[PDB]
Amino acid sequence: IVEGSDAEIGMSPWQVMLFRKSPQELLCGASLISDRWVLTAAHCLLYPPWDKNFTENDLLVRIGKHSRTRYERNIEKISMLEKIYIHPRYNWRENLDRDIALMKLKKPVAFSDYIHPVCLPDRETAASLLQAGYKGRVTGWGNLKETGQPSVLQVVNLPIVERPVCKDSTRIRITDNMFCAGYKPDEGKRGDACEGDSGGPFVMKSPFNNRWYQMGIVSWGEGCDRDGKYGFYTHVFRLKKWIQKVIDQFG
């Protein structure tokens, strides 16, 4: 996260770290959506251009974390993966269209002050909140700058951007399964996701029921926090029928 700040304790209790077993290293962010299901970006698990194709036994999820590198004894919980599910129309070839994946945990994780699931939006919450200018919040342990790494989880609040502005900011083909967020050059303020924040959540606090909803997944950008560029996020609601199909069938 570029131009963010240290998270408060318990500020993002749905935050999940995807962790490689060997070598032990951070792979991505992710989010807790129930006691057995974790949501992330498909490219965190499958990205053939970079020879990335993880299997369940390659990975762990670490839940309840604040510190990036510490083993947070008596606070974090570490879970093994039962199964990975990647969207069947995830487009790793071109533009990361449908950049979404689910991971089912081998055993349910116990909720605590530090571990708690985020809500997924329904159609009405998405229609109300996914509007240009409305701000969401992005969290992660990724790079602090485009070209180091944070001691603790970072947080930044960013406005959703009008779709024509998103489209006009890049040569990559945008789809309805994406939205973009960030400040414009004339707005002064700054901030962005960056490499290592992939898969983490873009959340909004509904003013109707005072609950946090995950509207996006950190998906892609061109550099980090560049003037005239924006971060792109998977549109969770647009892909929710797939999420529900997987959870109903498997779970």
Partner: peptide, 29 residues
Amino acid sequence: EADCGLRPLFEKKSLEDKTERELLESYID
């Protein structure tokens, strides 16, 4: 979950985090 999105250390104890108001102020409808 019926309790989703309500943080134990914030919403559950009616405490606000330091920047959630910035989000609320942007929700202009």
